[PDB]
Amino acid sequence: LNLDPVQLTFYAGPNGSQFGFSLDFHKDSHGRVAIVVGAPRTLGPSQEETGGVFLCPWRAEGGQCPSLLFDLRDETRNVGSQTLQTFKARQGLGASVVSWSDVIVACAPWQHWNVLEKTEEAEKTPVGSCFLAQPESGRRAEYSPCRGNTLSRIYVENDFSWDKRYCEAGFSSVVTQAGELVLGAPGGYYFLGLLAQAPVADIFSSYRPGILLWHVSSQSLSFDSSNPEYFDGYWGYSVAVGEFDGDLNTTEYVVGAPTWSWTLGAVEILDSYYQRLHRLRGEQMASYFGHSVAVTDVNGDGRHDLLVGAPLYMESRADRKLAEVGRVYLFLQPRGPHALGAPSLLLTGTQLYGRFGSAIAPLGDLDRDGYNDIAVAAPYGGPSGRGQVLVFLGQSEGLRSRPSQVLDSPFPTGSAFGFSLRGAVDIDDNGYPDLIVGAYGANQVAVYRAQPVVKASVQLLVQDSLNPAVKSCVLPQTKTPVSCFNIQMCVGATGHNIPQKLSLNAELQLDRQKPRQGRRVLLLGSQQAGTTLNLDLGGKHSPICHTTMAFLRDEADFRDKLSPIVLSLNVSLPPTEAGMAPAVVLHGDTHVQEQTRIVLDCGEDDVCVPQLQLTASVTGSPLLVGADNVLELQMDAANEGEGAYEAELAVHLPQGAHYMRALSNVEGFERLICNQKKENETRVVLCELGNPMKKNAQIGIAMLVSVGNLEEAGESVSFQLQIRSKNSQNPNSKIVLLDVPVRAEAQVELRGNSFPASLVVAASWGPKVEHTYELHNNGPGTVNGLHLSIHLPGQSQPSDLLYILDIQPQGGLQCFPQPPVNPLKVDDPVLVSCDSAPCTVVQCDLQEMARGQRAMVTVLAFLWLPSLYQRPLDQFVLQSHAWFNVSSLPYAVPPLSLPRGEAQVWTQLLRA
Amino acid sequence: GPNICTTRGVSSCQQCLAVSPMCAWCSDEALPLGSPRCDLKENLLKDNCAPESIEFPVSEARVLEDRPLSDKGSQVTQVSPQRIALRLRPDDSKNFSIQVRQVEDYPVDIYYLMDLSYSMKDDLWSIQNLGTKLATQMRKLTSNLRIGFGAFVDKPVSPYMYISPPEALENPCYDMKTTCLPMFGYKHVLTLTDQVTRFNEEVKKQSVSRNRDAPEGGFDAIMQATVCDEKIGWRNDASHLLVFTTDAKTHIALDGRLAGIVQPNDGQCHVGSDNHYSASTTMDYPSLGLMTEKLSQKNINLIFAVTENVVNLYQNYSELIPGTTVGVLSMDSSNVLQLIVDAYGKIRSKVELEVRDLPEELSLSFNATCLNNEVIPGLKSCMGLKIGDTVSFSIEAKVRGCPQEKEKSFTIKPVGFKDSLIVQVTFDCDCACQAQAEPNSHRCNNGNGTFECGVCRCGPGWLGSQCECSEEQDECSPREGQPVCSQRGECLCGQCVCHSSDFGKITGKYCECDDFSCVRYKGEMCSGHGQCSCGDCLCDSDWTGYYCNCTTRTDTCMSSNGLLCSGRGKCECGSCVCIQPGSYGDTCEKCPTCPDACTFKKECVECKKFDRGALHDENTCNRYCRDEIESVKELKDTGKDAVNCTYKNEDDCVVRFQYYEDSSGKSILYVVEEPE
Ligand SMILES: *[C@@H]1O[C@H](CO)[C@@H](O[C@@H]2O[C@H](CO)[C@@H](O[C@@H]3O[C@H](CO)[C@@H](O)[C@H](O)[C@@H]3O)[C@H](O)[C@H]2NC(C)=O)[C@H](O)[C@H]1NC(C)=O
Ligand SMILES: *[C@@H]1O[C@H](CO)[C@@H](O[C@@H]2O[C@H](CO)[C@@H](O[C@@H]3O[C@H](CO)[C@@H](O)[C@H](O)[C@@H]3O)[C@H](O)[C@H]2NC(C)=O)[C@H](O)[C@H]1NC(C)=O
Ligand SMILES: *[C@@H]1O[C@H](CO)[C@@H](O[C@@H]2O[C@H](CO)[C@@H](O)[C@H](O)[C@H]2NC(C)=O)[C@H](O)[C@H]1NC(C)=O
Ligand SMILES: *[C@@H]1O[C@H](CO)[C@@H](O)[C@H](O)[C@H]1NC(C)=O
Ligand SMILES: *[C@@H]1O[C@H](CO)[C@@H](O)[C@H](O)[C@H]1NC(C)=O
Ligand SMILES: [Ca+2]
Ligand SMILES: [Ca+2]
Ligand SMILES: [Ca+2]
Ligand SMILES: [Ca+2]
Ligand SMILES: [Ca+2]
Ligand SMILES: [Ca+2]
Ligand SMILES: [Mg+2]
């Protein structure tokens, strides 16, 4: 939230270079903290861009950087016939600079090694490297985990596989806190992916300077796979460590795969032995799902929550169908081994081509609020198009979709500002995890310093009502009859590491919503609209409360006595200090509005005790869960006592409820019925009347309840109604509680017909006949143990007019005929019914069926020529009936009816 | 008679002409104080208002150019009217007819891109004769054709190609016995030429290269082919077609990090004097939105031509890039010809209108009316067109306020076509009595006030033509029980002066109607698509429904049969809801219990021939009867590829016909001519 953009110091580094592109907070020779910033294409020994790794210390002046020296001087040997050399030119040392407690592990992902097969060759394939230089000097020892020799054709395998030349080791790495080291290698097994793991304690041991081929016994690489999903997945583009899927000791991997399943992309969670646990699928094609993977606990539950970038994400709008605005997904971790389904929420930038989501850096509790916050950078964002960095703050639900803070690029166009970020470590022991942003186009690195944050809390206290008759004060310097009343203000700001010299300007305004000649209340002394009070909050978190002395003006001064009096409060930091860089950054609530009125319309007894009366009723008691329910709850509010001020009804609605509109004892409306209980506080957002309620006034309100998709409402929902007023004594009427039951009876309709119904004769096997029976619980309520019983005349015998060929039940329904159908493939009307003649009842059972689901069963049969030609002058009518029922509903007592029904199928014959 | 003009606008002539088009203002200063100044024209005439004081402003949709739409594309204008001197007033809308029409004989630009990786060799050996066989066909569809050629492999940089021995830096093709050409990212070959033989000459001399990984660098080649307008040779009055062949995946942006190439593509074109994409090894791959906007601006149409091994990928792409068509390309690549002709037929069939530089305060609701009279509401595009066909539209623009910019403009354009409509928008917000204002009039409190349009502007707390009253008494409310000035003003001398509001101003004769107090749909004032009307949401021009939730979206409502929600179902908010029980599908097209083509679609014999029955007084007689009525007479084809059917009429006569499906659906009838 803080990220001071006025002094973004600059660790300027070699002009060319790309000074930047990677960075990480690393220790010093004796404790302390420094900055390791990668810098490809710098300090060419023989003037070829090798790209040293700088070791910039911390200083506010932003000077140049001392260098961590490597043996950038080639290494070459030969064992018996393999003249192997590790070519050292045109690699980006510093492209990853991940560190450890006393070890810098800076890597050079495009470093080379040429596995010639004596005379034959298998190329200087970038095997990557990781130049594990120890600070405090000591062994500067290097280990490219893919440095296993090969004679080319032997372990091409003739599959082109089982060979791992192009690892590019160092493209991503996170030193596990246990003491291992992972080296995500997007080129493993022909670009399919890799993940080389090795301990860091022993790796230093197993080094022979001058040796080119040597494999540590403790390597463990991901196994090649043949699934055409993975082929050129770039698996291991970015990795992470996190206790995702319950593998504590066999700590999981979060291996990225930004181009998987033909550019859909995925982020997979794997154990130490490369076994998948889940897989998160990309939402949009070519959106680069997984370019930057961040593992952090946004919701503050104790479960790591995955964040995935989609930098090339394109959105559809009314005014723009295709707009590259980037997107950042969030996946909250559910309890247990439960699968990660749909994205919990989607963050979205606004600038075109801003490449939103190109770098996600978990900033930690940036504002120290208990919820982790992340930073999503826009290299090409901002109105000018030079680049932006958008900061999002976590909460219980996840991330708020709007950027709490935005930084514009101070370096010119082309600087690619925001390409790389870091967090989680305070850079200057100021108590806040800073952020260090690279701009590789500008060869500079600008670090943003998080400044101590204060939490704004606004509160304006006023008396409940204004009584003109009570005039115990006087207006100073005059004799105005004043209905004086005291007004108190209270504002506090808490925070951590707040500067010891912090002050605020507490400004209060009287008679806010009213002009100079329409004011009703003023300061007694100065006779002014308001004044500003000074507060000393340096090092003190408890609020300061001050009370002002407010009066009422003369009756003849102004005519309006019925319009309400509205007051507004604002709190803002004192003006910016010299050199900008505000000492703190103010957030939270900033504006609050309160209102009061004069005692009026309480009768003639001066004792204003309202008696609000409310009557309530319930319509549509059987609530179908998630249906097109149209509920118009009608209640009437009457005040049999005296005047009630700002008396409005507050009703608590479930999550799935939505407001469609409504009139009420309106005669003021029909589309507006507001609702209180809105998010935090706001227990008045509803409409007013308290304005005030006239004596014996009777207003009835009608509002529409639309029960939406709420499958987690439970066995029932409760509606609570109570009128809320500004009064102190008897502020509210009697509590009206309406336990509207949700006892769910689902409506299942049984339908059936014959195809074709009629049968004409034209001029050896006859045409087939389809009988269509469809089952669909149009009732949105869930049903369990649904039963279908098929009753047919006869027992499917060949002697019948119709011979059943087969039954083909689709839609996940299983039926059990008795006796079983299709015993043989072959190829005054008498009422023959299931009850009279022997019957073959086919019973179908459904354990669970979802809302709006449908079922389809197809019946196959063929005609009989000898039977058809019999009785040419007789009309045959074929009748078939179906029955179904529901054994029970998954509820304690839904004592209305067990769902059931029947269908009728008619078939007729005609003569031509 | 009180109306909207009376109880709302009692301030100025400007507000009177801003409220409603009917509202009329009288500037006669001798009118008695109390009568409604802004009211019906007949009402003002009845109060003997001065005719010069009567204000009657009317918007108009005035056409400046109405040049006839040409017959042949041999300037040839397809969009009429060419240019509109539109004139709008505050909070008003205006309508006008636009007849887009695809003239036959429109010139065609084709730029044949091509991939050149190692797996492309056979296709190259097949395409060596492409180009004369493309002209041979396109000579039927247009008179002027120009073709171009291209190539691409991938970024010339490790790890994407083979480089050892140091003698394989020039020849990545050494490990295998045959040799093939080096690295290259994109190389323009031929500029669009009339002589079609030049493409054939140029493609022969090309030869295959080799890379390492399966995906290739085509997107760079497409962007460079788009942006170098001068280099390619694009025409301005023609059709631009870009054919993009491949047989594997294609690299996208940020894939180039594996080589250290991190500079994002700027969108310019860097094809130097050697026709080689110079920044190939220093510039990243191209995104998908840059791709789309560059194809749009240059009026470029893209035709993908993947191999089945990947269609499902590319068609999963040509759907996030409008104006694009995917196809199946055989491995030998002998079908790109017919694919390109089918793609040309397809691109011209669809006719969609796009609006550019449309100001935020303006909204356009279309209302197609394609071939026949389908005044299809909520539609801005038509299909099934034929070359030479004409379509019409009903486009209406609504302005939100009186914007500061007096002259603003926007364009309405057919997809990938030169000619388009230029809209001159003028906001008329000026009265007549304004010019003759009398500031410092002596009648306005001894000369400290300005008199204009029959009112002296007294100071705060004072009102009237002479500021006669400050404190005091009349009736300031419509009803006795109603509050004075709606709790929003003061009964100052019989007039309600609305209180000051931080957000804005309170209007109405008694300060009754506000301006910022309407309901929302998703945290947005009238869904962010409506406008505030004294407690009720009113939508903009292209926002339908009471809640202003949803615009003229139809893409998901479009059905392959050729209508919204197939036959059954209303297209509510771009989505189709099934009405017939048992019917399901994308547009409820599948229905097992529904009548077949032989049962329900017999109205061609009933409504088209011997007009009788239902659907006679509605525009649905030929809406469903629009199939090819072939005049066959009982052919000896009583069922070979479909189901033959025969019905009995009222007079016991049989009619035999058969049409179910030939290739994904054919609206061809086989009804007999003479019944028996
Ligand atoms: C182009 O996009 C379409 C749509 O995304 C891809 O096909 C569809 O992909 C979805 C997502 O997996 C499939 O849903 C799945 O259904 C199976 C059961 O059928 C279920 O087990 C999965 O969990 C998931 O729900 C959908 O079936 C699938 N449909 C088709 C037509 O394949 C399509 O594959 C994309 N083209 C390619 C190959 O990139
Ligand atoms: C989109 O276009 C349709 C068609 O213009 C609009 O619906 C139509 O509304 C108009 C009145 O605004 C109707 O006009 C009248 O038609 C009758 C003949 O039916 C004629 O005798 C009258 O003189 C007058 O022209 C028109 O019939 C009606 N058309 C239909 C059925 O769609 C629709 O309002 C437009 N959408 C909007 C609001 O822009
Ligand atoms: C097309 O434009 C005309 C003229 O602007 C509109 O005319 C309206 O007609 C109705 C009905 O008589 C009147 O109540 C309106 O006051 C007229 N408005 C104006 C501005 O003249 C007509 O409604 C428009 N139709 C559409 C759909 O745009
Ligand atoms: C760094 O290189 C750039 C581009 O060639 C040049 O403009 C600049 O002057 C050089 N160094 C500085 C910062 O002077
Ligand atoms: C705070 O904002 C309000 C308007 O929302 C303004 O009236 C006030 O003057 C501002 N701050 C102060 C207390 O000056
Ligand atoms: Ca653990
Ligand atoms: Ca969590
Ligand atoms: Ca936070
Ligand atoms: Ca700090
Ligand atoms: Ca091929
Ligand atoms: Ca390649
Ligand atoms: Mg290839």
Give, rounded to a whole angstrom, the gap between the first and last alpha carbons of chain B.
70
The answer to whether A782 and A744 are in contact (CB under 8 A) is yes
Cα separation of B393 and B413, whole Å? 12
The answer to whether B534 and A671 are in contact (CB under 8 A) is no
Choose the mutation target among A41, A150, A312, A687 for the interface with B, i.e. most B CBs under 10 Å.
Answer: A312
- Tokens at residue B397, please? 């623009």
Residue with tokens 């040597």: A214
Q: Are strands B108-113 and B239-245 parallel, antiparallel or unpaired?
A: parallel
Cis peptide bond prior to B21, omega within 30° of 0 = no
How many A from CA of B97 to the centre of ligand 3? Answer: 14
Indicate if ligand 2 lies below 6 Å from the C-beta of B50. Answer: no
Quote the crossing angle between the two packed helices B289-297 and B218-227, to the nearest 10°: 30
**Beta strand residue intervals within A29-129, DSSP E:** 34-37, 53-54, 67-68, 75-76, 85-86
Indicate if ligand 2 lies below 6 Å from the C-beta of B365. Answer: yes
The experimental method is cryo-EM
Cα separation of A886 and A787, whole Å? 6
For chain B, list the domains and their CATH numbers: 1-57 (3.30.1680.10), 60-103+353-427 (2.60.40.1510), 108-349 (3.40.50.410), 553-594 (2.10.25.10), 601-676 (4.10.1240.30)
Q: Kindly list the distances between the CA atom of residue B62 and the CA atoms of B84, B86, B368, B372, B564, in Å, as whole numbers in the listed order.
A: 6, 6, 21, 27, 34
Nearest to B7 by CA among B510, B611, B588, B560: B510
Residues of B with CB below 8 A from A319's CB?
358
Dihedral (Cα; B98, B102, B105, B109), 10-degree rounding? 110
Cα separation of B197 and A209, whole Å? 64
Residue with tokens 């009748």: A879
CB contact under 8 A, A514 and B499: yes
Residue with tokens 């500021």: B467
Q: What is the CA radius of gyration of chain A?
A: 38
Q: Residue B270, by phi and psi: left (phi above 0), alpha (psi -120 to 50) or beta?
A: alpha
Cα separation of A685 and A503, whole Å? 33
Atom of ligand 2 nearest to the CA of B95: 39
The Cβ of residue A903 has, within 10 Å, a number of other Cβ atoms equal to 17
Determine the distance in angstroms separating the CA of B447 from the nearest CA of chain A, rounded to an integer. 23
Q: C-alpha A458: how far from its chain's center?
A: 30
Angle at A815 between CA A814 and CA A816, to 5 degrees: 130
Indicate if ligand 1 lies below 6 Å from the C-beta of B76. Answer: no
The answer to whether A711 and A626 are in contact (CB under 8 A) is yes
Determine the distance in angstroms separating the CA of A501 from the nearest CA of chain B, rounded to an integer. 35
How many A from CA of B492 to the centre of ligand 9? Answer: 61
Cα separation of A842 and A857, whole Å? 12
Residue with tokens 């925070």: A495
In sequence order, which ranges of B528-647 are alpha helices (DSSP H)? 603, 621-624
Resolution, rounded to a tenth of an Å? 3.1
Query: Which three-class secondary structure state does DSSP give residue A234?
Result: coil
The count of C-alpha atoms lying within 13 angstroms of the C-alpha of A463, restricted to the half-sphere facing its C-beta, is: 18
Determine the distance in angstroms separating the CA of B399 from the nearest CA of chain A, rounded to an integer. 16
Phi, psi of B135 (to 5 degrees): -65, -40
Residues of A with CB below 8 A from B158's CB?
90, 110, 124, 126
Q: C-alpha A572: how far from its chain's center?
A: 32
Indicate if ligand 1 lies below 6 Å from the C-beta of A262. Answer: yes
Query: Which three-class secondary structure state does DSSP give residue B134?
Result: helix
Tally of helices (H runs) and strands (E runs) in chain A: 2, 52
Cα separation of A170 and A127, whole Å? 9
Nearest to B501 by CA among A519, A515, A568: A515
Same fold, A604-742 and A749-908: yes
Cα separation of B136 and B149, whole Å? 17
The answer to whether A899 and A748 are in contact (CB under 8 A) is yes
Which residues lie across from B216 on neighbouring strands?
Answer: B250
Enumerate residues 6+ apart whose C-beta is below 8 A from A353.
Answer: A324, A380, A385, B287, B289, B290
Nearest ligand to the C-alpha atom of residue A423: 9
Nearest ligand to the C-alpha atom of residue A453: 8
Q: C-alpha B550: how far from its chain's center?
A: 15
The answer to whether A351 and A413 are in contact (CB under 8 A) is no
For the domain A749-908, what is the CATH code?
Answer: 2.60.40.1530
Indicate if ligand 2 lies below 6 Å from the C-beta of B367. Answer: yes
Query: Which three-class secondary structure state does DSSP give residue B546?
Result: coil
In sequence order, which ranges of A161-316 are alpha helices (DSSP H)? 200-203
Q: Are strands B108-113 and B145-149 parallel, antiparallel or unpaired?
A: parallel
Q: C-alpha B657: how far from its chain's center?
A: 41
CB contact under 8 A, A353 and B287: yes
- Scored b (16 or more CB within 10 A) or e, B607-630 reads bbeeeeeebeeeeebebbbebebe
Tally of helices (H runs) and strands (E runs) in chain B: 13, 30
Residue nearest to atom 18 of ligand 3 (CA): B21
How many A from CA of A483 to the centre of ligand 5? Answer: 27
Cα separation of B382 and B401, whole Å? 32
The answer to whether A325 and A351 are in contact (CB under 8 A) is yes
In this complex, is the C-beta atom of A314 within 8 Å of any C-beta atom belonging to chain B? yes
**Beta strand residue intervals within A101-237, DSSP E:** 131-133, 140-142
Cα separation of A509 and A570, whole Å? 9
CB contact under 8 A, A234 and B255: yes
Ligand 3 binding pocket, CB closer than 6 Å? B 21-22, 59, 92-95, 396
Q: C-alpha A586: how far from its chain's center?
A: 26
Q: Kindly list the distances between the CA atom of residue A538 and the CA atoms of A198, A432, B422, B469, in Å, as whole numbers in the listed order.
A: 51, 18, 62, 55
Cα separation of A722 and A648, whole Å? 8
What would be the CATH architecture of the domain defined by A454-596? Sandwich (2.60)
CB contact under 8 A, B259 and A186: no
Determine the distance in angstroms separating the CA of B70 from the nearest CA of chain A, rounded to an integer. 32
Enumerate residues 6+ apart whose C-beta is below 8 A from A194.
Answer: A146, A164, A167, A169, A184, A185, A186, A187, A188, A221, A222, A235, A236
- Tokens at residue A298, please? 């946004």
In this complex, is the C-beta atom of A311 within 8 Å of any C-beta atom belonging to chain B? yes
Nearest to B239 by CA among B346, B131, B81: B346
- Tokens at residue A596, please? 């009061």
Annotated binding site of A for Ca(2+): 243, 245, 247, 250, 252, 297, 299, 301, 303, 305, 365, 367, 369, 371, 373, 426, 428, 430, 432, 434
Nearest to B535 by CA among B544, B524, B525: B525
Q: Are strands A585-588 and A453-461 parallel, antiparallel or unpaired?
A: parallel
Which residues lie across from A689 on neighbouring strands?
Answer: none
Cα separation of B106 and B123, whole Å? 31
Indicate if ligand 2 lies below 6 Å from the C-beta of B374. Answer: no
Nearest to A435 by CA among A362, A356, A380, A357: A362
- Tokens at residue B371, please? 């071939």
Residues of A with CB below 8 A from B293's CB?
322
Ligand-binding annotation for B440, yes or no, is: no
Nearest ligand to the C-alpha atom of residue A425: 9
What element of type H or E holds B97? strand B93-98
Indicate if ligand 5 lies below 6 Å from the C-beta of A575. Answer: no
How many A from CA of A529 to the centre of ligand 5? Answer: 13
Substitution candidate for ligand 2 out of B375, B380, B619 with most atoms within 8 A of CB: B375
Q: Are strands B83-88 and B421-427 parallel, antiparallel or unpaired?
A: parallel
Query: Which three-class secondary structure state does DSSP give residue A720?
Result: strand
The answer to whether B83 and B424 are in contact (CB under 8 A) is yes
Q: What is the CA radius of gyration of chain B?
A: 34
The Cβ of residue A464 has, within 10 Å, a number of other Cβ atoms equal to 16
The answer to whether B53 and B360 are in contact (CB under 8 A) is no
The count of C-alpha atoms lying within 13 angstroms of the C-alpha of A848, restricted to the half-sphere facing its C-beta, is: 2
How many A from CA of A180 to the centre of ligand 6? Answer: 14
The answer to whether A127 and A169 are in contact (CB under 8 A) is yes
Residue nearest to atom 6 of ligand 5 (CA): A570
Residue contacts between A and B (CB atoms, under 8 Å): 163
Domain boundaries, chain A: 69-224, 454-596, 604-742, 749-908
Residues of A with CB below 8 A from B489's CB?
560
Enumerate residues 6+ apart whose C-beta is below 8 A from B330.
Answer: B307
What element of type H or E holds B325? strand B324-325
The answer to whether B391 and B385 are in contact (CB under 8 A) is yes
Q: Kindly list the distances between the CA atom of residue B354 and the CA atoms of A595, B414, B422, in Å, as whole numbers in the listed order.
A: 50, 7, 12
Give, rounded to a whole angstrom, the gap between the first and last alpha carbons of chain A.
86
Enumerate residues 6+ apart whose C-beta is below 8 A from A711.
Answer: A625, A626, A782, A851
The verdict on domain A604-742 having CATH code 2.60.40.1510 is yes
Choose the mutation target among B249, B320, B353 for the interface with A, i.e. most A CBs under 10 Å.
Answer: B320
- Tokens at residue B426, please? 């003028």
Q: Are strands A814-818 and A405-408 parallel, antiparallel or unpaired?
A: unpaired
The Cβ of residue A370 has, within 10 Å, a number of other Cβ atoms equal to 10
